[PDB]
């Protein structure tokens, strides 16, 4: 989920 | 009523090529970003591909980078994982995934659909 | 790669009776933005996983308040306030904090007859 929010 | 329809799964040839799709239905798809997660045999969850809602950007796992390819067309509402070089690994249930912005985590997932490889 | 460790592998419970789970992480959860993003995650047999719980302790709309979740860092639980006989499956932990995205082994509970 990180990747969504970089 | 959210739904994820996964398809394409079946039996492939170790070194072969398969495109998976899911159908995305009940809400506005081309808004979120989506996933693919596969389920092993001792029911293990292992994360594949993510691509954004936005610009096209994607990202991969080091097990499936430079073999697969994940994409979208917004117009079908539909979500792909192109496979290829697959290997007997990558046999799995694979899972479409929405992610939710909206609330900071992965919500929705499809049903599955099985891919095995095997000669 | 963030490690993810369930505790217990496997639950049996009686209908009625309280049950808890813990997850714990090899590194703390505590992302860069000040959010804790742990979540908790049931798989019914022969069915889709299902959200439990997000950012720790927010309780996804379509569960019921006798699942909660608690803890931070690297630390975490989920506590079942009362069992089901619908509560029957795989619970697994995953956090979105880190790149990449990882789960815990699951946890299978089962109901005690």
């Known amino acids: 989920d990180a990747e969504f929010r970089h | 009523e959210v739904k994820l329809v996964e398809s394409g799964g079946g039996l492939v040839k170790p070194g072969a090529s398969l495109k998976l799709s899911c159908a995305a239905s009940?809400?506005?798809?081309?808004?979120?970003?989506m996933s693919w997660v596969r389920q092993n045999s001792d029911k293990r969850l292992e994360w594949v591909a993510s691509?954004?809602?936005?610009?096209?950007?994607?990202y991969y796992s080091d097990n499936v980078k430079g073999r697969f390819t994940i994409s979208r067309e917004n117009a079908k509402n539909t979500l792909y994982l192109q496979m290829s070089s697959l290997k007997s690994e990558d046999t799995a249930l694979y899972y479409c995934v929405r992610y939710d912005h909206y609330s900071g985590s992965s919500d929705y997932w499809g049903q599955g659909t099985t891919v095995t490889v095997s000669s | 790669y963030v490690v993810m460790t369930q505790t217990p592998l496997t639950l049996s419970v009686t209908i009625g009776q309280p049950a808890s789970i813990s997850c714990k992480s090899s590194?703390?959860?505590?992302?860069?933005?000040?959010?804790?993003?742990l979540n908790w995650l049931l798989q019914r047999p022969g069915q889709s996983p299902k959200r439990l719980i997000y950012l720790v302790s927010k309780l996804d709309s379509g569960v019921p308040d006798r699942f909660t979740g608690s803890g931070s860092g690297t630390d975490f639980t989920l506590k079942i306030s009362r069992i089901e006989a619908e509560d029957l499956g795989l619970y697994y932990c995953w956090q979105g904090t880190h790149f990449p995205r990882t789960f815990g082994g699951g946890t299978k509970l089962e109901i005690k007859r």
């Open positions: 009940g809400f506005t798809f081309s808004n979120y970003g």
């Open positions: 590194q703390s959860l505590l992302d860069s933005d000040g959010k804790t993003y």
């Open positions: 691509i954004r809602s936005g610009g096209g950007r994607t």
